[PDB]
Design an enzyme around this catalytic site. Structure first.
Site, short mmCIF file in Angstrom:
data_model
loop_
_atom_site.label_atom_id
_atom_site.label_comp_id
_atom_site.label_asym_id
_atom_site.label_seq_id
_atom_site.Cartn_x
_atom_site.Cartn_y
_atom_site.Cartn_z
N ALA A 117 28.91 35.16 32.50
CA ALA A 117 30.15 35.66 32.82
C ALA A 117 31.39 34.68 32.97
O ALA A 117 30.82 33.54 32.74
CB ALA A 117 30.01 36.52 33.79
N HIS A 118 32.53 34.99 33.02
CA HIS A 118 33.54 34.12 33.42
C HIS A 118 33.21 33.46 34.36
O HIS A 118 33.01 33.72 35.61
CB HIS A 118 34.88 35.06 33.52
CG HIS A 118 35.04 35.80 34.77
ND1 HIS A 118 35.05 35.38 36.20
CD2 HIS A 118 34.51 37.12 34.97
CE1 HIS A 118 35.06 36.48 37.16
NE2 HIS A 118 34.70 37.61 36.25
N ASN A 119 33.57 31.88 34.46
CA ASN A 119 33.57 30.99 35.54
C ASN A 119 32.03 30.57 36.28
O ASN A 119 32.15 29.90 36.90
CB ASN A 119 34.67 31.65 36.68
CG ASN A 119 36.06 31.68 36.45
OD1 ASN A 119 36.42 32.52 35.99
ND2 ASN A 119 36.72 30.41 36.57
N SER A 137 31.77 33.90 38.27
CA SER A 137 31.84 32.83 39.27
C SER A 137 30.61 32.56 39.91
O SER A 137 30.70 31.93 41.02
CB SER A 137 32.87 33.18 40.27
OG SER A 137 34.37 33.38 39.72
#
Lengths: 337, 337, 337
Positions: A239-241, A259
């Site tokens: 996922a993002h981050n 994250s």
């Protein structure tokens, strides 16, 4: 095909030759299917039996293993036959010495492409892109504006590198993966979802491998980081981050949510799920289908799952599971008036 | 790098300004990495410490938060900072209004392509296809016969849209994704599988987002339907005839099996398994790796799974799990004489 | 659109005609949505009440069902209506008639392409490749060096076939799938991962179907084998060296790790994970999300998982679960003297 002398092959893995150094070898092969012109390896004594019977012409072995193979004449002795094997797989691996730019490709005039890189048919490379020396970019793949690919990289077909992702050296990414895609960001209001643009990128370190049909999202504001030497099998969601530490392995179908940071030298087995905003310490191994929801602070091995049941046994087990909440467990383990 | 005045930004989110309304800003940024020329947002009082320490030029906050931020001067006061932030991410998002049909597109003479649409390179579009106003269809993508994309849609590269799928307005679909694919229909006879052709389609509502490496299969007879405002992350399986209610959210790696119906306003966390031919009622959250095998009739939060365990505690836990069937549970709780 | 007479259809399924032989029909359809020109089918008594209300012009029913259907005049009698329905789906399924090679393709001269094959737009076919009679390769797909594809095969877009893969006849492979990509082979030395080249290939038998977004890796030294009949849904991981027995069914989102052998006539439900170096015997059924870690050596149905729980109930359950290891369970049910 093409032949190699034993002596060359032992020298290449810096090992001690035994038997006729001048013997020809076509390929590596398994214990079972090897023939005379095939070189094979014995990985510990569990495989002594298959070795003894193998029709292979030479053996990659430990010294303490050579002693248990009097039946055989030609050897290569090393401390780690598995790694010697791994090295030699590339010697026999049939290589893509291809170089140059296929005329169907569309490379924006601003991009710097090394003269020793390969750009496949119908590849599209955008503004400010850089592709380094001896890098191989296969057909149909697209590189969006501002994407940088280092040296000795392999990127197969229908790979999307976007979100201005930056890739270091010796990075390999297989077919149908998405690097730098717009992650899943949505704000609620009036019980409807407002899309959140995704303004970050991806940093991808040296010696990193990613399988096929993977989704590596770009960060929401900062970066998704895959540190040096990280390995990732097919169908992974990052996922993002997400920040994945050095030399971490992630098996097929794992999902790491938004994250989350994963430490150095971690090993996740097939289909683990790690929730968002979590830290997982260095040297954490998770077994197949682990559901991680809190942080992991200590190094070690961690698991979840019920294990396998015969179906009827299962049906009754989960009925008895459903009943556990109404049973005071510890308040009877020591209840004796 | 294009700039925006702090007073415009506050106007753009229906917000009260505090500070020097003429200040310049290049981008949004996170609390930890913001510089002077960066706007940022403080999402509830859990982040005050990161906020106070941040080098951000201005701040998107609530009235109750501006108070605990004496350290800072320029703010934008709104009621939902996350949403004001969500809006502004687009203003900094690298906007692309390219238009027309690239010359390497292959389009059937019969297809209706809006003059404001963009058909990218190597795009293939079949008979009776309709691409509506302001729709972007990126390079390499394919549209089979009788597929219709509405207005203002974004369809990325290596997307297959087949089975005369019908997508409405504001629908965005990411890379390596298959909309309309032949579903998994196989009848058993003579211990072999007779493949069942699949004659249905897919209806995709307004304001629907689908991620990368997703598979949304068409109906066996009727339609697979995704209602208005449904949002789906990467690596999701939607089987033949699944119907998903308005604004339902489906995270990465979920599988929804054939003919199942999921209500309005549902939330499915990552890696859920929903089995075939079920109803899940409106307003149902499932947590991660949840396994649903029966209908869910009442709204609420549902879960399956064991927790994470350290490995030795897992091994002994599951040994005792296996014994649980042979153990009278409700016949010892009431057993006190 | 295209019309059929009831008697033709009755004949096509070796079926007893009842009612006007000369009636016109456009399509199959569900009991719910059928109109006069739609043929439909009643699958056992469960659906009788739906059938009574159907506006369907004709009904594929079995004798002891026509019985309970006086409301209706037109029938086709057969012993198994589902299989009869399946045979007729293909009669209505829109024929893909095309032959030839599109000019936007790139095919190495040392490749042998049948005059009855279709090569779609933008396809790339490498050296020593073979494409059998009546086979369809849809647009954008690539075949690397030494790939062979038999007769009557269908291979959709954005498929990568590599690793010298061999495909027999009537193989169908759906979109975004990667056949024979480098497997997950890595050696550990000095807390780093040395890549192991992957020297085998993939054999795929006749009548195999693979979904979209699948990864079927080539073998490390020997081959990865899918026997005849094998059916595989979307999003599946089949690791290096996995061996899959005739007529086995693999549901969406499963993962089979490296070197695992799976017997004939098995059924794995969605999202199972099978660990590496394991045997599963013939005729094994796994339920959704089962986790196999040891060999399964007897036929039977196996499972894992907790139930679905309401969330509060779940939380207390896992707390109790955690307490289970410290509790002697067999020593207390046998505690009465």
């Amino acid at each position: 095909v093409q032949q190699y002398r034993l002596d060359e092959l032992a020298h290449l893995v810096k090992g001690e030759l035994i038997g006729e150094g001048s013997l020809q070898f076509s390929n590596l092969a398994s214990l079972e299917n090897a023939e005379v012109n095939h070189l094979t390896f014995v990985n510990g004594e569990k495989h002594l039996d298959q070795a003894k019977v193998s029709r292979a012409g030479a053996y990659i072995v430990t010294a303490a293993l050579k002693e248990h193979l009097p039946e055989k004449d030609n050897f290569i002795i090393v401390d780690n036959p598995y790694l010697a094997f791994a090295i030699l797989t590339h010697v026999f691996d049939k290589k893509i010495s291809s170089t140059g730019i296929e005329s169907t490709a569309r490379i924006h005039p601003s991009a710097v492409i090394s003269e020793t890189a390969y750009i496949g048919h119908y590849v599209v490379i955008g503004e400010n892109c850089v592709v380094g020396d001896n890098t191989v970019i296969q057909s149909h793949t697209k590189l969006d504006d501002n994407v940088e690919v280092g040296k000795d990289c392999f990127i197969d077909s229908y790979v999307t590198i976007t979100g201005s992702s930056k890739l270091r050296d010796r990075v390999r990414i297989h077919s149908s993966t998405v690097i730098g895609g717009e992650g899943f960001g949505f704000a609620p209001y009036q019980g409807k979802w407002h899309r959140i643009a995704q303004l970050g990128s991806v940093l991808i370190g040296n010696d990193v491998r990613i399988g096929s049909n993977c989704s590596i999202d770009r960060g929401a504001l900062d970066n998704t980081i895959l540190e040096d030497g990280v390995i990732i099998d097919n169908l992974v969601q990052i996922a993002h981050n997400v920040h994945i530490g050095s030399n971490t392995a992630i098996a097929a179908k794992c999902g790491i949510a938004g994250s989350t940071k994963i430490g150095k030298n971690c090993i996740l087995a097939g289909a683990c799920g790690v929730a968002g905003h979590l830290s997982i310490a260095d040297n954490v191994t998770l077994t197949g289908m682990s559901m991680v929801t809190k942080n992991i602070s200590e190094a070690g091995t961690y698991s979840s799952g019920t294990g396998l049941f015969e179906n009827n046994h299962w049906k009754k087990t989960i009925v008895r599971l459903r009943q556990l909440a109404d049973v005071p467990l510890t308040q009877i383990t020591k209840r004796l008036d």
